[PDB]
Structure 1
Amino acid sequence: IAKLPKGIGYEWTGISLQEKQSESQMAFLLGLSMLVVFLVLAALYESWAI
């Protein structure tokens, strides 16, 4: 689609749009889970490095 002349835009809908939305947010919802686990374990150990 990038090769088409100017003035034509592609919009993803249906299943494809949901796939894109799911793929976009993976990193945020892995990093946040990792940080939450880090914080909880640090709380329950009283040690930052443990």
Structure 2
Amino acid sequence: IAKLPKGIGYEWTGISLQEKQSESQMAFLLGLSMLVVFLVLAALYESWAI
């Protein structure tokens, strides 16, 4: 579209717009879940490596 003639634009619609605004959310949530699990397990085992 950026290669199209001047004065022509575009918009994503439907699930496409939701996908555009939901980028990297899954990775951030996965990392946060891993951190929370690590913290909980460290609390349970009273160790930073177990």
TM-score (norm 1): 0.73
Corresponding residue for 2:45? 45
How far apart, CA to CA, are the structure 1 residues paired with 2:37 and 2:31?
A: 10
| Shift in Å, 1:6 | 4.6
Could you list the per-position Cα deviations for residues 12-50 of structure 1 after superposition, in whole angstroms to 9, with x for gaps in the alignment?
121111223334311111100000000000010100000
Between 38-47 and 10-19, the greater mean CA deviation after superposition: 10-19
- For structure 2, the 5+ residue unaligned runs are none
- 2:3 partner SS: coil
How far apart, CA to CA, are the structure 1 residues paired with 2:8 and 2:38?
A: 47
Q: % of aligned pairs identical?
A: 100
TM-score (norm 2): 0.73
RMSD between aligned alpha carbons?
1.8
Runs of at least 4 residues off by over 6 Å:
none
- Going from structure 1 to structure 2, the CA distance change for 1:24 and 1:17 (only over 3 Å counts) comes to farther
